[PDB]
Amino acid sequence: DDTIVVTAAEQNLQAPGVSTITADEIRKNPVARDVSKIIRTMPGVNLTGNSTSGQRGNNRQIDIRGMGPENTLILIDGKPVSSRNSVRQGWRGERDTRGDTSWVPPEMIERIEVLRGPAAARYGNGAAGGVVNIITKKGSGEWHGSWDAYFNAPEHKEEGATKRTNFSLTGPLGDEFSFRLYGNLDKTQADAWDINQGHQSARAGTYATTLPAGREGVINKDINGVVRWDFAPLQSLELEAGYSRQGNLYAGDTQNTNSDSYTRSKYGDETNRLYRQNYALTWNGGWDNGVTTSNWVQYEHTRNSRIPEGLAGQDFVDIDLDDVMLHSEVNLPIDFLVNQTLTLGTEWNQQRMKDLSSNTQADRSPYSKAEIFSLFAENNMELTDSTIVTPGLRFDHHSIVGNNWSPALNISQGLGDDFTLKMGIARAYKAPSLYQTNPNYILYSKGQGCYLQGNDDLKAETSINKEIGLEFKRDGWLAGVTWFRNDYRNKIEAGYVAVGQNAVGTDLYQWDNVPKAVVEGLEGSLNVPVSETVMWTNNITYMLKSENKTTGDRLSIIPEYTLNSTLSWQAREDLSMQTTFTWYGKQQPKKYNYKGQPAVGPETKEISPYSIVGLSATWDVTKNVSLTGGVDNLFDKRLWRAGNAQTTGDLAGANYIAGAGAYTYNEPGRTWYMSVNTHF
Numbered sequence: 001d002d003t004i005v006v007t008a009a010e011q012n013l014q015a016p017g018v019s020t021i022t023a024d025e026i027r028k029n030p031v032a033r034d035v036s037k038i039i040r041t042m043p044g045v046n047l048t049g050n051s052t053s054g055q056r057g058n059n060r061q062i063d064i065r066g067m068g069p070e071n072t073l074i075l076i077d078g079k080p081v082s083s084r085n086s087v088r089q090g091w092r093g094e095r096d097t098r099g100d101t102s103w104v105p106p107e108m109i110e111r112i113e114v115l116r117g118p119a120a121a122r123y124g125n126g127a128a129g130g131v132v133n134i135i136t137k138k139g140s141g142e143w144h145g146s147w148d149a150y151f152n153a154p155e156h157k158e159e160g161a162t163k164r165t166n167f168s169l170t171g172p173l174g175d176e177f178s179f180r181l182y183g184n185l186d187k188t189q190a191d192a193w194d195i196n197q198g199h200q201s202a203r204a205g206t207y208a209t210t211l212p213a214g215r216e217g218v219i220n221k222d223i224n225g226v227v228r229w230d231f232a233p234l235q236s237l238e239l240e241a242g243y244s245r246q247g248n249l250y251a252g253d254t255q256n257t258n259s260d261s262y263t264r265s266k267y268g269d270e271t272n273r274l275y276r277q278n279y280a281l282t283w284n285g286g287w288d289n290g291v292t293t294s295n296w297v298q299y300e301h302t303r304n305s306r307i308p309e310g311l312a313g314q315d316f317v318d319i320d321l322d323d324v325m326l327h328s329e330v331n332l333p334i335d336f337l338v339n340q341t342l343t344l345g346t347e348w349n350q351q352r353m354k355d356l357s358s359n360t361q362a363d364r365s366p367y368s369k370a371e372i373f374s375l376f377a378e379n380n381m382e383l384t385d386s387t388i389v390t391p392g393l394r395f396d397h398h399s400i401v402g403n404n405w406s407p408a409l410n411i412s413q414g415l416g417d418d419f420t421l422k423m424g425i426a427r428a429y430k431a432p433s434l435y436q437t438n439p440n441y442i443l444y445s446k447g448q449g450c451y452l453q454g455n456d457d458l459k460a461e462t463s464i465n466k467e468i469g470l471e472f473k474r475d476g477w478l479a480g481v482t483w484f485r486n487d488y489r490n491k492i493e494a495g496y497v498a499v500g501q502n503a504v505g506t507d508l509y510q511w512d513n514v515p516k517a518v519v520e521g522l523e524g525s526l527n528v529p530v531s532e533t534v535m536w537t538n539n540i541t542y543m544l545k546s547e548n549k550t551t552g553d554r555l556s557i558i559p560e561y562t563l564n565s566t567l568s569w570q571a572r573e574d575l576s577m578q579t580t581f582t583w584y585g586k587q588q589p590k591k592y593n594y595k596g597q598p599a600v601g602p603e604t605k606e607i608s609p610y611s612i613v614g615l616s617a618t619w620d621v622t623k624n625v626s627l628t629g630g631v632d633n634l635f636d637k638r639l640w641r642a643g644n645a646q647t648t649g650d651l652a653g654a655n656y657i658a659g660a661g662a663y664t665y666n667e668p669g670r671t672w673y674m675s676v677n678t679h680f
Contacts, residue, residue, distance in 0.1 A: 001335075003339065004290045004339075005380050007331045007378075008343050013113060015422065016422045016469025016471065017484065020113055029630075030616070030630065031150075033186075036102075038112075043540065044521070044523050048060055048063045048556055048557060049665070052093070052590055053094075055092055057644070058251075058664075063556050064116050066556050068129065070095070071126075071127075076134050077133075077134070077136055079298045080325060081300070083300065084100060085302075085351070085433060086321040087304050096272060097274070103222070105186075109134060109135065109137065110136055112132065113131070116484070117424070118425055121406060124394060124406070125430060128430045141230075145168060145170065145679065146167060146678060147167045149163075149676045150673070153671065153672045162189070164184070166184040167182065168182035176230050177227060184222040187220075188219075190250065193211075196212045196256075196640050201657060202602070202658040203658065204649075204656060210256045211254065212640075212641040212642055213263075213641075214641070219270070220245070222244045223243050225241050225242065233286075236283075237283055238282040240279065240282070242278045243277050243278075250267055250270070252266070252309070255267050266307075277301045279299045280297065292330070294328075299323070300324075301321070305318045319354070322352040323351045325349045328345055329376075372397065372398050374395055374397070378393075386413060398460060401460050404460055406426070418473050422467075423467065423469070425467075426464075429460060448507050449509065452495070454511060455512060461513075462488075469482035476529030482524070484521055485520040485545075489515065489517075491514040491548070516550070517555055520543075521542055523541050534570075537565065537566050540562070543585075551596070552591065557588070560585035562584055563581075563583040564581070564583075566578055574621070576618050579613065580613065582613075583610075589603065599646065601651075605663060610639075611637070615630060616631070625677070626678075628677070629672075629675070632673070633667075636669045637669075638668070645661055
């Protein structure tokens with residue numbers, strides 16, 4: 001019998017908490033400044049700030065199932081992106097990066113895999129929330145190429161516009177060789193410095209001329225090369241090198257005085273930079289035998305050169321991150337008593353950091369370094385014609401933190417009538433950062449929270465993630481309901497109790513483990529082939545629970561439910577159109593302030609449910625030219641950041657900024673856009 005069973009990894013793409021977005025979907029929904037705009041329309045995915053304090057509220061990233069953006073792991077072609085680790089995390093979880101879903105130009109994406117909960121855990125370190133694996137378009141050995149451009153146009157200028165243009169080339173490079181090359185340039189203007197004027201929370205005294213800043217701008221440059229050697233049947237070697245330069249257009253958190261202040265002297269300048277270099281060597285092999293192997297090595301070098309903000313107690317300060325990842329694995333089809341494919345592998349990862357942070361403040365440390373070594377086995381077993389079980393175990397040894405065991409089990413059972421029952425459970429793993437495990441890494445906050453330092457005795461974060469799903473599927477019909485729950489263990493947050501004062505009576509805290517937190521909810525999907533030419537797709541997500549069991553507070557600020565819906569019409573064979581609709585449930589902020597007291601008055605403001613609609617059309621004029629036009633936010637529904645979620649100062653004193661509650665971000669208004677794709 002020659003029916004091989006698919007690998008556990010492939011099987012897992014069928015888990016109820018996995019979604020795929022195609023190049024076609026991407027081409028019809030042109031992205032402006034970030035592809036997370038399309039990733040967030042998947043069920044169980046939200047766009048939210050790094051910190052539930054509302055700080056850096058206009059820097060939103062992909063959050064999966066309410067676990068927080070920090071818990072989403074991004075891979076490019078299966079390889080982890082560590083770049084975010086060159087920027088230190090703040091006291092409250094804020095992180096001054098643009099996220100990791102903007103390294104790959106949108107037009108270069110073949111497809112996107114979004115894995116959530118149990119399916120995502122096998123990827124190891126960093127996957128507590130989920131995995132977003134970005135797959136690039138591959139070349140075929142013959143000449144092909146593309147030349148594209150995109151730009152939008154906000155009806156309200158305060159809102160920054162985006163322009164993007166890119167190209168790719170691929171072809172034969174000899175006998176057994178080939179190459180792919182692509183380059184990208186994009187620019188997104190920063191929002192106007194006074195965009196939130198007339199919307200700022202109440203403030204006074206030293207804060208009265210201050211305003212909440214809008215979104216910061218960005219400038220991207222990228223170049224990527226790949227050489228592929230197809231030396232044997234089912235045998236290839238692939239060498240990749242790439243380079244990206246990401247720069248900001250400053251606005252900050254309070255780009256606001258009406259005065260010509262420090263905030264206003266930088267507004268629009270590049271004050272922060274990221275240079276990312278990645279190099280990879282990949283060996284994939286196959287045999288008539290059924291056996292496959294995948295072995296690669298990646299070296300990622302990231303430099304963060306930023307102008308520091310504030311003080312303690314224009315010149316760029318740099319931080320360099322080095323990451324080398326080794327990965328090796330074989331897939332063995334096996335006929336024991338039942339058909340099955342055994343996967344066996346190992347990974348080695350080393351990360352080095354070189355800083356320029358000693359901080360007098362009257363702690364000096366040059367490097368940081370850590371290694372993770374891993375072993376893992378997975379098996380995909382075909383128990384019956386309708387029954388599949390995939391058990392797995394991953395072993396991780398972290399150089400500072402020790403051993404971690406991560407078991408997983410996903411089951412799939414056909415129930416007849418094109419109905420399926422699916423369940424999974426897995427233990428996720430996230431190791432603390434070079435920063436959080438370093439006693440030398442300190443942070444001060446005017447307060448006495450006073451000083452916060454590393455902690456070499458931190459446990460890794462862990463998470464038991466579960467899901468049960470029911471799905472009906474056929475002929476373009478799809479209906480599904482999924483229940484999920486994560487019991488999050490040892491989340492690393494700023495500590496809740498001093499560990500002793502200093503040489504002044506000044507209190508010191510550590511990064512520490514929160515014992516328990518929970519996230520629970522429901523996911524639904526509904527696709528209706530309305531007509532041979534008309535499709536209607538929908539997904540809904542509803543949150544039952546989000547909570548840090550230690551503070552009793554929310555883990556992430558997201559809509560209580562989110563509904564996404566697309567209605568598309570294939571009018572001509574070369575012409576389509578679509579309308580897009582999203583509806584958000586209400587957004588409730590934190591319940592308690594920094595000193596554990598109930599949020600009061602303004603700090604408690606919620607955003608009511610709201611919706612945004614878009615329309616767009618794509619016309620393939622020739623098999624070489626495509627034009628796409630659309631408008632986002634058809635009804636111009638807008639939101640403005642009013643400041644951080646909570647009150648700073650004293651409402652009854654002379655100096656203060658009233659809290660914003662959940663109004664921590666700008667939803668941009670009606671916007672026109674156009675896309676021109678040229679290809680062969």
